[PDB]
Design a binder for these strands. Structure first.
Length: 148
DNA sequence: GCGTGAGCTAATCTATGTGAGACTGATGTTAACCCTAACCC
């Protein structure tokens, strides 16, 4: 229902719905991380929903941005049950950024909006990351410079 | 992704009226208690 509300007119309700959605994902990530992971079904469903949202063209920037943000928040408490899954993370996101908006003289066609979500998401996984691959760090620096 | 202005139809919003539910008190009716034409032993 929150996602359905997010796709609506009367931009005031749109803002309220997106804020509620972001708060709901932030909270659910909080109690997911706050305890030992014994509810992996919810995490799997959330990841599947996020992948479905981001691997199709039917949405505006708001839903893609919120899916990316939720991806970032749930990056944190994913390594507890699935080690080296975080290692998979921080790699797909950077490659996505590189193929999306790393070509100079941006012919993006409305790609700027999703960028701060990318920075928040990559930071979130960065906090709980060990042994940085040290190869994509130039890409991360380029990304931060581009966002600035 | 988002501001900004125009027209519209939905939503009031009070004035006035009408009826349903609760109430209250004056009233008249029935009734307890006793007295009275009249006779006549």
């Amino acid at each position: 229902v929150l996602l359905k509300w997010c796709a609506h007119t009367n931009v005031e309700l749109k803002k309220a719905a997106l804020s509620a959605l972001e708060s709901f994902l932030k909270q659910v990530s909080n109690m997911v991380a706050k305890n030992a992971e014994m509810h992996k079904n919810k995490l799997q469903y959330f990841m599947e929903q996020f992948y479905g949202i981001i691997r199709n063209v039917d949405s505006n920037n708001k839903e893609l941005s919120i899916a990316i943000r939720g991806y970032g928040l749930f990056a944190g408490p994913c390594k507890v049950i699935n080690a080296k899954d975080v290692d998979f993370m921080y790699v797909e996101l950077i490659q996505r950024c590189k193929q999306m908006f790393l070509t100079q003289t941006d012919t993006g066609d409305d790609r700027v909006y999703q960028m701060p979500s990318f920075l928040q998401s990559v930071a979130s996984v960065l906090l709980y990351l060990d042994t940085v691959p040290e190869v994509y760090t130039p890409v991360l620096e380029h990304l931060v410079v581009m966002q600035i």
